[PDB]
């Protein structure tokens, strides 16, 4: 499956793509404002994620740091990134279909649209100004709006017992972005697409 990752932000981002224990394609790359990076993701990838990283520094070897979404200091991510990270999430070729969503379970850093480029399902978008509106207790000094699990480390925010409900903090993300997951047991906003669809993730779509 091909994913075209497009940076429509006025600022440079460093895209990242991983299934948690491995890079997807190169794993990461710089995208200046307006640049497009096409990656190939193996069919049947389960639990894949694409995100943006902000305010990164990398040396010649591809090691450094990002203010948001840092993946162990690597340009070429092989693991998931450090919150806050708006997440484009996908499991492909799962019994004939692909499944896509946007999640704010790990916070929000950059606005995102995640849409098919092929026929047969709709896209999802979280493009509201979540950083600017972020509750004070969730604001990431590094930049971004953390989720409440990251900040407070409770069973209720992290849904550790599988019994949690919505919270004042999850309802903030949900209000700004109804089409993204706001907490682990949120009513799903997952979209069913044709198996072997192709996609585009646009940062700052508006």
Numbering used by the authors: 1 to 206
Provide passages from the article that reported this PDB entry:
Here, a series of new methods are presented based on the use of a low X-ray-background film as a crystallization support and a photoablation laser that enable the automation of major operations required for the preparation of crystals for X-ray diffraction experiments. In this approach, the controlled removal of the mother liquor before crystal mounting simplifies the cryocooling process, in many cases eliminating the use of cryoprotectant agents, while crystal-soaking experiments are performed through diffusion, precluding the need for repeated sample-recovery and transfer operations. The CrystalDirect system enables the automation of sample mounting and cryocooling and can contribute to closing the automation gap that currently exists between crystallization and X-ray data collection.
As an initial validation, crystals of proteinase K, thaumatin and lysozyme were prepared in CrystalDirect plates. These crystals grow from solutions that typically require the addition of cryoprotectants when mounted manually. Femtosecond photoablation lasers, such as that used here, produce little or no collateral damage to the sample owing to heat conduction or shock waves.
